[model samples]
Target: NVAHGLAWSYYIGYLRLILPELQARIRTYNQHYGAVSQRLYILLPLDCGVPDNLSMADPNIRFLDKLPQQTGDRAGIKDRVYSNSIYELLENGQRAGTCVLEYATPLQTLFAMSQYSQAGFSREDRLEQAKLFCRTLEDILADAPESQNNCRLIAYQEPSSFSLSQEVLRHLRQEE
Candidate 1:
C-alpha cells in the first residue's frame, strides 16, 4: 500500500480515458437491458519503478486469468444489473495489493440516443464488448510507460466496502 498515492495519481487520468471504452461496451448492454455496473480490481506492483528497456515481448507481461467472467445478475430479470471479474498476472505470478474501481451505467442515455438516432444492441454482443475492453486495457498497460505497465486489472461480482480514503489514511498514519 506504500505506493497507494502513486497508484491513484498515475491511474486516475487513464481511468477517465478508459471509462469511455467501458461505457461504449456496456452501453450496448444498457440499451438492451436498462442499467449495468462493473467493478475492476486494479492490482499494482509494490515497486513503482519500471525499467526503460522493458520490451513488449517480455515474459513479465501477462494476464493471470482467462477472459473476464460475468459474476452476477442482481435484482433478477427486472433489473439489468450484472458484473464481470477481471485480473492480471505479475512477474513470476506473484500476488499484489489492489484498489477497486466501480461504476454504474444507466440506460436512460441509451434510450435518449436511440430516440434521436436509431441504433442497436444485443447480448453475446455485450459479452464480446467486455472481452474487447479487457484486451484493450491489457494492451494499454503492456505499452504504458514507467510503472503503468506493471498494473493488473481485476473485476468482481460483489461490491466491496473497502474505503480508499480510509486505507490511505491508515497507511499514512502508520508511516508516521
Candidate 2:
C-alpha cells in the first residue's frame, strides 16, 4: 500500500566533506516525486569500512565491541531506517571497463563468498533493489503536507565489521 521510500548511501572514505552532493541527491529524489514528499534516508557507513559504534567515551572515541550482537542487526523493512540491500560495481558479464552497479540481499554476499558464483548479483536482485528505491521515493511524495512543505530525514549508523568482509565482498562482486 505504500508508494515511495527515498534512500541514499555513501562511503565515508569518499565523503571527506558531505552536503553538496548529499543535498543534490536528496533534492533530486525529492523533486522526482514532485516537491510533495520530503522524507529521506541518509545511509552512513556502518562497519563497511569505517569505525563502528562511534562514541565519545571517558576520554577517547570508542567502539562498543562488548555490546550485544543483536544491536548491530538490521532494523527491518518497516522501520524508517532499515538495511535494504547491498550494491557493488559489476562489469557487463565481464569486460570493457564499463560496469553495472549490482545489488543483492545482505546475505547473498555471504553465499557468494562461501559457495556459488551464480549469486553474483542476479537480474532479479537488481530489479528488486532498484524498484524498492523508486518506491521509497514515492512514499515521500504521498506523505507530503497539503498546505505546508517538508519531510522527514532519517539516518542510520551502526558498527558491523572491519573491512575484511567488505573487502572480501568487493572481490566477490567483481570476481567476474
Candidate 3:
C-alpha cells in the first residue's frame, strides 16, 4: 500500500512569503493532530522540502529502513512534472533556445530499487507496511484542506505513473 498509497505534488507557480497567520494555523493543527500522530506537513505552505526526520527522537517515529519491505498498494505509479517546452529567441547570448523541467514519483523509483528486486520479509510484513502507508496517506488527505483546494489530486491506476501523458519530446527539442 505504501507504494500505491503515495502521492506527489507539483507546485504550479511561485508562492508568496509566509505570513504569521499561516504559521499559526499550521502550528494549531499540528498540536491538534499531534495526539493522533497526523500532524500537518508544516513545510508545505512555506513552499520548501521537509528536512530529514533525524530530530524525531521519539519511538513513535517510523522509518522504512527499520523494517524489511516488499511492496506497495497500487504501487509504482511515478508522476513526472516537466516544463512545457517554450522557445523564445532573442540575441544568441548564452541561454537555452528552449526551457524545460521534469518530475518523478517516489514509488516508481523505490519499487525498482527494492524489486530489482526480491524479498523475504513475509506476507504479513508487506501487508503491514501497506496498511501503515495507507493510514498515513489518509491522514495526510484528511488534514490537507489547503492542498485539496489548491491542487489537482490524481490517483492514477497502479504501475502507471506519469506514463499517462507526456510532452512531444520532438517538439520539446529544436534543431538548428
lDDT of 2 by residue, 1-176 (tens): 11111132222111212222333433443355212112222222221122222221111221211110111223463423222111221233322221111122222232233344554544434334444544453354355332122222221223433332233234333434
What lDDT does candidate 2 reach at residue 4? 18
Instruction: Extract clashing residue pairs from model 2.
Output: 4-135, 4-136, 4-138, 4-139, 5-135, 5-136, 5-137, 6-136, 37-140
Tens-place lDDT per residue, model 3, 22-123, is 334334433543111111121111111122342232222222211111122223554322111112211223222222111223323334334443543334
Per-residue alpha-carbon lDDT of model 1 for 1-176, expressed as tens digits? 11223234334444434443454444454464312233233422112112222223233332222222223233464434333322222334552321222222212222233345334543323333333444444555565553332223542221324333233223323423
How many angstroms is residue 111 displaced in model 1 relative to the true structure, after the best TM-score fit?
A: 12
Query: What are the clashing pairs of model 3?
Result: 1-72, 1-73, 3-72, 4-73, 4-74, 78-161, 78-162, 81-103, 83-101
RMSD of candidates 1 onward, in order: 19.1, 17.3, 18.4
Give Cα distance to truth, residue 120, candidate 1, Å.
2.0
TM-score of each: 0.27, 0.19, 0.25
The candidate that wins on lDDT is 1
Best by TM-score: 1
**What TM-score should be assigned to candidate 1?**
0.27
